[PDB]
Amino acid sequence: ASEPRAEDGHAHDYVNEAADASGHPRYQEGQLCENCAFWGEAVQDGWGRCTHPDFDEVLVKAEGWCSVYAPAS
Numbered sequence: 001a002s003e004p005r006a007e008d009g010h011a012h013d014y015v016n017e018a019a020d021a022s023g024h025p026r027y028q029e030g031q032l033c034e035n036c037a038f039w040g041e042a043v044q045d046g047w048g049r050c051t052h053p054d055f056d057e058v059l060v061k062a063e064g065w066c067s068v069y070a071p072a073s
């Protein structure tokens with residue numbers, strides 16, 4: 001459905017703003033959920049799904065990021 005907007009730190013070091021993860025060793029800039037290889041699709045107001053069972057439970061922000069991120073290039 002319109003699953004609840006994901007918590008900062010829901011799982012896998014996720015942040016609602018990619019930029020927050022500047023502190024995270026695995027982070028590189030430009031990487032947003034919307035450009036994640038595991039991106040599902042955008043659902044609503046800068047929120048969309050993420051194709052991981054350990055994620056899709058909650059609606060991830062398009063500008064979010066997590067450590068399971070893999071680039072789509």
Ligand code: SF4
Pocket residue numbers: 014032033034036037038039040049050051052055060064065066067068069070
């Ligand atoms: S794997 Fe992570 S970075 Fe990628 S869309 Fe899902 S929550 Fe976002």
